[PDB]
Amino acid sequence: DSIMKILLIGDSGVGKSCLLVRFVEDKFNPSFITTIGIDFKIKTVDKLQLWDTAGQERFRTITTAYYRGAMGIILVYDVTDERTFTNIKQWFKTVNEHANDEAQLLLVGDQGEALAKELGIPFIESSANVNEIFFTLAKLIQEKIDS
Template identity: 45%
Template sequence: MAHDRSYDYSFKLLVVGDSGVGKTCMILRHVEQQFAASYISTIGIDSKVKVMNLDGLKIRLQIWDTAGQERFRTLTSAYYRGAMGVLLLYDMTNSKTFDNVRDWLQNIDDHASPDVIKVLVGNKKDLVDTREVETARARDLAATHGIPFFESSAKSGENVDECFLAAAKLIYELRRKQEKRTVFDSPSSGGTVSRQPSTIRVEAARAGNQQQDGGGCSC
C-alpha cells in the first residue's frame, strides 16, 4: 500500500536561546507570517509545522519552540534527541544573551547528535538605536564554530524565512549524504536511492510530556 504523505522529508528543528530573544516571534513570523507585539513566554515546549519547497521536494519542518529560562534548561535538553537542526537565537539589543551563546553551543554539543546542523541568529535587527552586539563580533563567533550566521527581525520579517531555509537546506544535504552512504553500504541496493518519503522521527521527552522585540514582545 502506497504511502499517503504530502511531503518527501520531515525534519525536527529546535529554536533555542535565552528568554526574551524572540524565539516564539520568529516561529510565528515564519510559519504564520504574523508578529505579536506582546506574547506570553513559552512554558516548556511548543511546536509548529511548516512545509516548504526545496529542490522540487516538499520538506516538512517540525519546529520546536523551547523555553529559554534557566529553570527549564534541563527539560528542553531532552528534546535535542532526534533533532537534525538547531536555530540558536540571541537578542542584538542585549549583550548578555549573546554572551550566553557559548553556553547554548555547549548545551547543544552535550545533548544533540554530533552532526546536528546549527545556525546562529541575531534577532531584533529593527532596533537599530539600542543595538549592543556588533555584527562583526557575532560573525567571528559563528566562523569560529563553523556555522551560518544571520541577523533578523521577527517584527519586520527581515531574514526570518532565510534562517529557516538555510537550516532546512543544510539538513537536507546532510540527509542525502547519509542516504548515499546507506546505498553504498548495501550490497542489494543496486546503486539507487529510494524516492519514498523519509521521516526523521520526532522523539518526545520521557519526563513531563509538555521579546521583548520592537513593540514589547517578550517571546
Template identity: 45%
Template sequence: MGKDKTLNANGTDFRQNGGGQAGGGMNGHSSFQGNSHLHRQASRQCSSELYDLSCKVMLIGDSGVGKTCLLVRFKDGTFLSGSFISTVGIDFRNKVVEVDGSKVKLQIWDTAGQERFRSITHAYYRDAHALLLLYDVTNKNSFDNIRAWLAEINEYAQEDVVIMLLGNKCDVAGERQLRREDGEKLAKEYGVAFMETSAKTGMNVELAFMAVARDLKMKKTRKPDEPQFNVAEYVDQEKTTSQCCSS
C-alpha cells in the same frame, strides 16, 4: 510583567486548573511527562499534507530573544506585537516547504529560555536535526550566554546536528548593543552559519529556515560522490543586507 503561557498548535492554552502545570506534567522539574503526548500531537499535524521528508528544528536561546516571534513570522507571516508572553516548556508548529522540487516538513519546536525549564529543553536536543540559536542584538547578556548554549548543544544534541546562530531584533537600531561583526566572529569560532534577523520586518527569517531545510534535504539525498552542502556558504551567498541591520 508578562505571563508565562504555552499554546499548542491550535492556540489552546496547555495550563490546567491554574496550577501552573502544562502539557500533562510540564512543570519545570527534571522531567517532562508530556513528551510523548506532544510528539504524537506534532506527528499528527500536517498528516493530510504530502511531504518527502520530515525534519525537527529547535529554536533555542535566552528568554525574550524573540524565538516565538520568529516562528510565528515564518509560519504565518505575521508579527506578534503587544505584551510579552514567555513560552512555558515546549511548543511546536509544522510547515511544509519546497526545496528543489521536494516537499520538506519542518517540525519546529519553540523552547522556553528560562533556566527553570532547561531540563525540559535538554530532553528534545537528541531528536533535533537542526538548532536555530538566537540572541538579541539589543541585549549583550543574551549574546554572552551563547557559549553556554553551545556547550549544552555539544553535550545533548546529535553530533551532526545543523546549527545556525541568529542575531535577532536587528530592526531596533537605536538600541543595538552588539555589532554584526560580533556575531560573525563567534559563529566563525564555532564553525556555524550566522545571520541577523528581524521577526518584526521579516528580514532573513525565511532564509534561515529555508537554508536549514535545504541542508537537511541535501543530507538525506546526497550521493557518496557528491560534495557536501555547506549551509554557512549558502547563507553568505543568499542573505541580503538591510539598512535596519547595519552595524
C-alpha cells in the same frame, strides 16, 4: 514523509521568539513561549517539527529530550541585549554533550561574525529574509541525506 524536525534555542521574548510567529503566517496560532518558556509549531515547505526554546524554564529536562532527535538547530540571541549574546557561548556548549554534533547546527542573532566563525557554523542577523533563514538550514539539512 520527509519531516525536518528543527529546534530553536535561546529565543528572546515575544520580540524574537516570535521567530516562529515570523516563520509561520498563521495569526490564529497562540504563542506560549511568552508565558510558558516553550512552544510547538509546525509548518510545511519544500514538514517541519519546530520546538522553540528559550532555555531558562522549568521544562529543561524536556527541552533536553528534544535534543535527542533534532535534525537541525539554531542558536539565537537578541541584539539589543549583550546579555543574550553571553549565553550563546553557553548555548553551544549545551548542544554538545546532549544533542548530536553530527546534525546541522546553526547560529543566528559585523561583530558577532567573530564568535560566528569561531564555531564553524553559518550566521545572519536580527533582520525582520527570515522566511529564508529556515530555507538555508533546511537546504543544508537535505544536503545531509546525500550520504
